[PDB]
Amino acid sequence: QDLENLYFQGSQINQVRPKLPLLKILHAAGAQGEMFTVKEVMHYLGQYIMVKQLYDQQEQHMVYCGGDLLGELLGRQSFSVKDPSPLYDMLRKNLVTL
Ligand SMILES: COc1ccc(C2=N[C@@H](c3ccc(Cl)cc3)[C@@H](c3ccc(Cl)cc3)N2C(=O)N2CCNC(=O)C2)c(OC(C)C)c1
Numbered sequence: 001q002d003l004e005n006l007y008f009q010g011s012q013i014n015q016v017r018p019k020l021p022l023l024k025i026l027h028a029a030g031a032q033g034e035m036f037t038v039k040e041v042m043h044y045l046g047q048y049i050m051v052k053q054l055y056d057q058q059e060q061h062m063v064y065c066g067g068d069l070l071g072e073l074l075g076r077q078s079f080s081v082k083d084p085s086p087l088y089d090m091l092r093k094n095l096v097t098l
Contacts, residue, residue, distance in 0.1 A: 016038060019095075025069060029044040041095065048070065066078065075090075
């Protein structure tokens with residue numbers, strides 16, 4: 001496992017540093033510091049949407065973010081968790097590999 005170990009050294013957790021606008025969002029959802037796993041980022045974004053009440057209480061897969069910093073980042077007024085392409089795009093641009 002010599003070469004496989006070498007390759008995966010320093011890359012087993014894959015922490016990211018959010019860009020400053022996204023960092024502010026994660027902090028608003030109760031995150032601390034500025035290094036996270038991608039899983040943590042998703043947890044805090046979900047929490048953010050809940051605490052800012054950006055989801056539709058009837059159609060809870062729908063997020064209305066156009067009011068919000070999150071909408072600015074995504075470049076959208078709304079999105080559905082069923083079609084999460086804008087979120088993928090945003091996180092590719094707003095997470096820096098450590
Ligand atoms: C049918 O109602 C649902 C179904 C799934 C989700 C959802 N689905 C999860 C999810 C969605 C897309 C991706 Cl790419 C990753 C994770 C995660 C999530 C994480 C980040 C963001 Cl920005 C939005 C949602 N995520 C949630 O954050 N949920 C999970 C369900 N219950 C919760 O308490 C919150 C959902 O999220 C809010 C819009 C309410 C609502």
